[PDB]
Amino acid sequence: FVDSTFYLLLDLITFFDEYHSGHIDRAFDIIERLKLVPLNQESVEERVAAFRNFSDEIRHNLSEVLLATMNILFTQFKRLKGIEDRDSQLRSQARTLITFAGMIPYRTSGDTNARLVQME
Amino acid sequence: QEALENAGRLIDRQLQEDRMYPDLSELLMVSSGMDMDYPLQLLSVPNLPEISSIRRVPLPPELVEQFGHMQCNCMMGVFPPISRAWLTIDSDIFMWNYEDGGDLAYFDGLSETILAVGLVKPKAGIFQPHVRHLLVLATPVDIV
Numbered sequence: 466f467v468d469s470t471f472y473l474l475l476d477l478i479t480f481f482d483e484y485h486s487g488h489i490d491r492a493f494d495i496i497e498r499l500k501l502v503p504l505n506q507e508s509v510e511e512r513v514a515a516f517r518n519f520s521d522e523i524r525h526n527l528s529e530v531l532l533a534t535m536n537i538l539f540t541q542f543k544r545l546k547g548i549e550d551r552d553s554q555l556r557s558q559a560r561t562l563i564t565f566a567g568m569i570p571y572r573t574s575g576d577t578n579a580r581l582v583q584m585e
Numbered sequence: 586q587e588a589l590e591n592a593g594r595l596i597d598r599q600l601q602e603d604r605m606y607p608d609l610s611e612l613l614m615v616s617s618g619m620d621m622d623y624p625l626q627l628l629s630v631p632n633l634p635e636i637s638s639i640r641r642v643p644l645p646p647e648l649v650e651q652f653g654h655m656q657c658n659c660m661m662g663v664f665p666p667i668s669r670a671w672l673t674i675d676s677d678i679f680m681w682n683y684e685d686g687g688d689l690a691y692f693d694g695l696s697e698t699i700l701a702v703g704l705v706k707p708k709a710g711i712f713q714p715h716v717r718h719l720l721v722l723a724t725p726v727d728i729v
Contacts, residue, residue, distance in 0.1 A: 505640045549679045549691020553646025558687065
């Protein structure tokens with residue numbers, strides 16, 4: 466258990482290194498790997514069920530996990546210029562993430578200013 | 586007598602037993618009638634249920650958007666090795682990451698309608714033997 470949290474913290478850190486310094490695409494891939502945040506469907510709630518269970522160390526970290534996601538998600542999905550462009554994904558991801566954030570704002574520091582980054 | 590040799594012998598014997606396990610299908614098994622544990626209801630077999638549905642992923646709207654206009658022909662499928670899904674509308678083809686969904690690739694190469702697509706292994710000895718997989722695409726006129 467102790468080691469597991471350890472690796473998670475390291476993974477999150479590598480995500481940080483690559484978050485900024487560009488590499489928007491890479492950040493999503495890694496964050497998803499964490500298996501902390503709902504990329505799939507409305508499984509956002511399962512992410513609720515598995516949230517309280519979370520160890521104290523991680524439970525604290527989630528705030529940044531979200532908003533990192535809505536950032537890369539934003540910047541990467543800068544509306545492009547002028548073909549296959551599936552904007553839909555990396556869009557659904559924000560949606561699931563927001564539902565997630567919506568469900569646990571009380572158990573979070575109190576910055577659903579995801580909204581600012583969310584829109585434009 | 587030595588425990589170490591003893592233990593090794595036990596595991597080996599068991600391993601042998603595991604390997605010997607009966608063949609999956611035999612006519613004799615259900616010659617009269619099949620034993621079935623069959624419920625119509627989901628999760629009807631509470632403890633036993635062989636499969637569960639972990640998740641549902643919708644086709645990304647970004648992908649769908651470039652499928653909006655299709656006069657002639659539609660088709661889609663999953664490539665087993667790739668862990669990617671493909672959609673064909675008319676001439677164009679999309680491949681999208683199963684795990685991601687945001688990540689999608691598009692073929693602009695094809696001029697004409699795409700009759701069929703398939704994933705195949707490369708030949709033993711050609712210039713591209715190295716590549717893991719080949720994508721065959723057939724249109725009315727050509728196979729690429």
